[PDB]
Amino acid sequence: GKLPESPKRAEEIWQQSVIGDYLARFKNDRVKALKAMEMTWNNMEKKEKLMWIKKAAEDQKRYERELSEMRAPPAATNSSKKLE
DSSP states (O other), X not given: OOOOXXXXXXXXXXXHHHHHHHHHHTTSTHHHHHHHHHXXXXXXXXXXXXXXXXXXXXXXXXXXXXXXXXXXXXXXXXXXXXXX
C-alpha cells in the first residue's frame, strides 16, 4: 500500500461520516457535534456502535494494505519477480 491511516471501526466510519455535518451546523460544533454522535451512538445500542465497527473495520482493511507494503518480504522480490 503506502500509508496506513488505521481507521477505528465504529468511532471512525461514523464520526468522520457525521461529524462533518455536525461540525458544520455550528461551524465548530465539535463540542456538541462529537457528542450528538457519541450519545446517539450508545442510544442505539449494539445496532449502531457494533455495526459501525465493521463499517470502518471493513474499511480498516484498506489501511492494512498500507503498512502491509513493508510487511511483504515474500511480496516484493519472490512474488514480484524482477524479471521480464
